[PDB]
């Protein structure tokens, strides 16, 4: 499908955990590698970006089709600070807005491996905004499930509305590297 995706990477200091071998950093590295190559393996013209949800968001690679540079600038991401989910997702929205080919459907694949210290009301409001603005959020929920999986579930349910299959929430329980689940997941199974 002609779609533009904005891979959001959580580079929070909580990524230091080794509960996803070798460390969550390399687990996210592999996940991003696989997802980017799969989007490329789809109709190639589709594009992939890169954002990091550090203490304050930052944008690593604006939409470019060659995944080599996304991966190269991903390799140097290091653990610092905490996560800001709302700011990250809105900055990703701005990145999508500045997309050359407006056909490309708006998707945001966010790795949310950190407690989202945001309020449920704000999350649902942001979900409503994205729902009206035609943005499909695929959340990779790995980490503090009980702390935030409630808020993420509310977010994704609001996004889906009543039949909005576009937005997905895949919770990965601690186990092998953070790819095996993704290679067969609703977000990637169709891709």
């Amino acid at each position: 499908v002609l779609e533009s995706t904005m891979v959001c990477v959580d580079n929070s200091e909580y990524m230091r955990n080794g509960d996803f071998l070798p460390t969550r950093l390399q687990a996210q590295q592999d996940a991003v590698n696989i997802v980017c190559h799969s989007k490329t393996r789809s109709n190639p013209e589709n594009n992939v970006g890169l954002i990091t949800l550090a203490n304050d968001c930052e944008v690593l690679t604006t939409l470019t089709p060659d995944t080599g540079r996304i991966l190269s600038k991903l390799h140097t991401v290091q653990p610092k600070g905490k996560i800001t989910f709302c700011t990250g997702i809105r900055v990703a929205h701005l990145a999508l807005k500045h997309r050359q080919g407006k056909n490309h459907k708006m998707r945001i694949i966010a790795f949310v491996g950190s407690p989202v210290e945001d309020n449920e009301k704000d999350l649902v409001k942001l979900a409503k905004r994205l729902k009206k603005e035609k943005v499909n959020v695929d959340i990779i929920n790995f980490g503090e499930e009980e702390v935030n999986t409630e808020k993420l579930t509310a977010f994704v349910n609001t996004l889906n509305g009543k039949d909005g299959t576009g937005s997905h929430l895949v919770t990965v329980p601690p186990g092998p590297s953070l790819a095996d689940a993704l290679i067969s997941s609703p977000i990637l199974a169709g891709e």
């Binding site: 390399q26 540079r69 390799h75």
Partner: peptide, 27 residues
């Protein structure tokens, strides 16, 4: 073994992309 294999993956991928890009630019 796993650490060395991960290092090889990172080296191969990232270094090959960087060499390709910088070779194209210098060309």
């Amino acid at each position: 073994l796993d650490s060395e294999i991960k290092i090889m993956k990172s080296e191969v991928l990232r270094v090959t992309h960087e060499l390709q890009a910088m070779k194209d630019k210098i060309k």
